[PDB]
Nucleic acid binder design. Structure first.
Ligand SMILES: [Mg+2]
Ligand SMILES: [Mg+2]
Ligand SMILES: [Mg+2]
Ligand SMILES: [Zn+2]
Ligand SMILES: [Zn+2]
Ligand SMILES: [Zn+2]
Lengths: 55, 50, 56, 55, 97, 290, 158
RNA sequence: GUGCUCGCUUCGGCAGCACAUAUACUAAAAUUGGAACGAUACAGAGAAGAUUAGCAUGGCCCCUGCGCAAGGAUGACACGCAAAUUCGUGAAGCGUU
RNA sequence: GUAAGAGCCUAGCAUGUAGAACUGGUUACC
């Protein structure tokens, strides 16, 4: 079980951020949703981060 | 042949799970194998149209 | 492709201590040597559960 | 005997441990043979302890 | 705590393999009833007694067999029924929003 | 996984003719010849001039297939696996290719460890239905000739410098021009082309059996070997099981008893159940058609 | 007549009437010799004995030397005692063991002795060979030729 | 094998007693299979033009390393005719109850 | 333009196994 030492830190942070967003959108969608559309919301989040960095 | 896995596909059922059995006898019935017909059958025919 | 996300994690229960101690290996880390082999407990002045029980 | 049985079990037939515990390649090695035959500090430290004892 | 400390000791025994290297002589007896009785099979008896000695292990002996071999994870226990509520009804308008 | 069990699974002609046995237990000594996962090796001496046999396969590979761990023959009947599967069904279908074998082994061992640890796991329900022809060629007395030291390979070249002190046999090896001399371990285990099993099933084919009526509907039973120390009022009681019994002709001058039943089915049955098996009044009751 | 047939490990002290009465009813026909015997793990019943070492190994070596021994069963057919083995030699030799002074004493074998350790290349203290039985055993006159035949038949295979 | 026997009783033998009580993965083998670089031809290194640092992720992929370090081409692989439950309108032509 | 097969293409390290199965049958009434 490899340790997050120094060169894994940003990749582990951005690995866990995606997982927290995945759990939140699985809990946030109501009961009759097709349970697709997670990848698109993750792309919207990556684009929102790029637009934050670009101001 | 020099490989660990791979020949396990045609030889037998790979990671076989038996269908769970209960409340109905299903030991008598069986299925019929496919017609070979090796004078018309093609590689495209098994796959189906693209 | 090569560059791809995860969408599922790696599951635990299949390595070095998980079911049969991975069939009893003779490999051990330097972090797995004996160290702090004595649990310290709360003393009577610190916050021992005998003293915590009667307190309002 | 221990050190060159460790050599001969790893199929490293292109190395030679002489009797004064010098490890030398018999030939010129490829990249794959050189990546394969790189020992660590355990083998070399035990080899040098044996060199001091043989002195 | 008695049940967990035993598994703790069995895990901790790996940490120092031989500091005071092992000692073995509980050579014991087991009385065995073969359960496939024959007039001539045991020789002439209902039971037989066997003296078991644990084999004496070489300290200067490396591990015997490969352990790194790995097979995929087997089937899990039988699926539990879900016990859910009756599917609250979804509308076209909220499905579009 | 490992195995780590106490007291192996042995028959009686491998465990020796001494009731007092010394064996050693080695914790993870060898690997299985089938499973290749390592197990607990038990090793004993059978008798005095014997070979020091040891267990060859796991507890698990003997639980799956109900055999002894060293001779790979049945615990109850003592016959090869292909013969016992021939006298039964074959619904185990253990995989022979590598990864499927270890996967099936892991899962069936999980099924064993998720149970008591006493029964044949899949062979029990098919082990209820038994007493086929395999009971009629099962060996009664122990075959102690297996437990016997190998041919001295220095004596075959005429160079046995130990002579009388050599514990290995100075006698003839078997001719390799023989089907009985190939004998893989795994072929004997999985029940595929075992020549010992071929000879036993061939012996089996020859053996006496109940037969069909010469003509249609005839439930007439021609019974030979009656004897005059019996009574015909008991026959009925030992026969009624089948159904209402039709005609019961009795002749004590030839000691033959003719019988009749409602259906031919029942007569076939009474043959089957009855032929080369039934004895009552401590006297064998022989049956034929017409 | 009071207790469960088998659960295990009774917490109270039982009576002979309340534990060893036989089970009522007929046996079921759905069990074989292996299934009707009270077996413990697939091949019979194994329980830890506590037999004395000397007496065990005495009877063991008595069987391994002659072919008879006493019965180590717990009850068997109820009875104080019997012998198990080649029973005819038990009552013949009065049932002696190996650890006792024997009845028969005849026909001892003959071997060399040079117990002095003074003659070099002549000493054999306990390494003395028998005078009758001899070393390297070449097989026979026809055994050799038939073994040459069987090795030749092996050569025709590979 | 040795010793003791107010043993026959000589120094020859025998008898009695005492102590001493179960080695060996049994081969100097016969067999049985899977395996040493590395040479032979081929083969050529990711990121939407080109030249390129890399960090990951997943597991019937491993190598070097004492390593829960770090390397192995970012170690390799991953590149997919990426289709999973379940349909309806309107007229228009033709035949039919 | 070097370890990546693949295959080859030749090799080599483990093994000291388990196992040899052979026995037979009578006939009669209006
Ligand atoms: Mg790296
Ligand atoms: Mg690069
Ligand atoms: Mg990587
Ligand atoms: Zn096994
Ligand atoms: Zn056996
Ligand atoms: Zn020999």
């Amino acid at each position: 079980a490899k340790t997050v030492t120094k060169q894994r830190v940003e990749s582990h942070f951005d690995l866990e951020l995606r997982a927290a967003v995945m759990h939140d959108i699985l809990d946030m969608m109501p009961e009759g949703i097709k349970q697709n559309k997670a990848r698109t919301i993750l792309q919207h989040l990556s684009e929102a981060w790029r637009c934050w960095k670009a101001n | 042949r020099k490989r660990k896995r791979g020949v396990d596909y045609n030889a037998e059922i790979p990671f076989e799970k038996k269908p769970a059995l209960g409340f109905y006898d299903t030991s008598e019935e069986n299925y019929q194998a496919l017609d070979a017909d090796f004078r018309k059958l093609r590689q495209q025919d098994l796959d189906g149209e693209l | 492709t090569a560059a791809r996300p995860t969408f599922e994690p790696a599951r635990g229960g299949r390595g070095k201590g998980e079911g049969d101690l991975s069939q009893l290996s003779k490999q051990y880390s330097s972090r797995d040597l004996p160290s702090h082999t004595k649990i310290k407990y709360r003393q009577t002045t610190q916050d021992a559960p005998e003293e915590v029980r009667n307190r309002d | 005997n221990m050190l060159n049985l460790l050599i001969h079990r790893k199929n490293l037939n292109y190395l030679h441990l002489d009797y004064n515990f010098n490890l030398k390649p018999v030939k010129t090695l490829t990249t794959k043979e050189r990546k394969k035959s790189r020992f660590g500090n355990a083998f070399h430290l035990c080899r040098e302890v044996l060199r001091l004892t043989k002195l | 705590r008695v049940a967990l400390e035993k598994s703790v000791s069995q895990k901790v025994a790996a940490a120092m393999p031989v500091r005071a290297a092992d000692k073995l002589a509980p050579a014991q007896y087991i009385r065995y009833t073969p359960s496939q009785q024959g007039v001539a099979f045991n020789s002439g008896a209902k039971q037989r007694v066997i003296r078991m000695v644990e084999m004496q292990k070489d300290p200067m002996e490396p591990p015997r067999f490969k352990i790194n071999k790995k097979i995929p994870r087997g089937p899990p226990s039988p699926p539990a029924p879900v016990m859910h509520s009756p599917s609250r009804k979804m509308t076209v308008k909220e499905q579009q929003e | 996984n490992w195995e780590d069990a106490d007291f192996p699974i042995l028959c009686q002609t491998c465990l020796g003719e001494n009731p007092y046995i010394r064996m050693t237990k080695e914790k993870y000594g060898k690997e299985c010849k089938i499973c290749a996962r390592p197990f607990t090796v038990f090793r004993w001496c059978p008798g005095v001039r014997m070979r020091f046999k040891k267990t060859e396969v796991c507890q698990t590979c003997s639980k799956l297939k109900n055999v002894c761990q060293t001779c790979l023959l049945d615990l109850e009947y003592g016959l090869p696996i292909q013969v016992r599967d021939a006298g039964l069904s074959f619904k185990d279908d253990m995989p022979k290719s590598d990864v499927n074998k270890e996967y099936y082994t892991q899962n069936m061992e999980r099924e064993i460890s998720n149970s008591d640890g006493t029964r044949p796991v899949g062979m029990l329900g098919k082990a209820t239905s038994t007493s086929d022809m395999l009971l009629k060629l099962a060996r009664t007395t122990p075959y102690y000739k297996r437990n016997r030291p190998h041919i001295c390979s220095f004596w075959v070249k005429g160079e046995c410098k130990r002579g009388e002190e050599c514990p290995y046999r100075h006698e003839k090896p078997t001719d390799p021009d023989d089907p009985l001399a190939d004998q893989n371990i795994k072929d004997r285990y999985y029940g595929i082309n075992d020549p010992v099993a071929d000879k036993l099933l061939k012996r089996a084919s020859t053996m006496p059996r109940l037969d069909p009526p010469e003509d249609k509907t005839i439930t007439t039973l021609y019974v030979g070997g009656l004897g005059d120390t019996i009574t015909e009022t008991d026959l009925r009681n030992h026969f009624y099981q089948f159904g209402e019994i039709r005609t019961i002709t009795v002749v004590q001058r030839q000691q033959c008893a003719f019988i009749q039943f409602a259906t031919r089915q029942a007569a076939e049955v009474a043959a089957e159940k009855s032929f080369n098996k039934l004895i009552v009044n401590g006297r064998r009751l022989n049956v034929k058609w017409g | 007549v009071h207790l469960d047939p088998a659960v295990k490990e009774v917490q109270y002290n039982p009576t002979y009437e309340t534990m060893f009465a036989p089970e009522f009813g007929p046996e079921n026909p759905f069990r074989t010799q292996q299934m009707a015997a009270p077996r413990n793990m697939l091949s019979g019943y194994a329980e830890p004995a506590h037999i004395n070492d000397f007496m065990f190994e005495q009877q063991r070596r008595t069987f391994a030397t002659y072919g008879y021994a006493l019965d180590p069963s717990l009850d068997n057919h109820q009875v104080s005692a019997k012998y198990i083995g080649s029973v005819e030699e038990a009552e013949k030799n009065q049932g002696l063991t190996v650890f006792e002074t024997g009845q028969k004493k005849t026909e001892k074998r003959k071997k060399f002795k040079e117990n002095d350790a003074s003659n070099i290349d002549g000493f054999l203290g306990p390494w003395a060979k028998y005078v009758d039985e001899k070393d390297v055993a070449k097989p026979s006159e026809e055994e050799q030729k038939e073994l040459d035949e069987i090795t030749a038949k092996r050569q025709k295979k590979g």
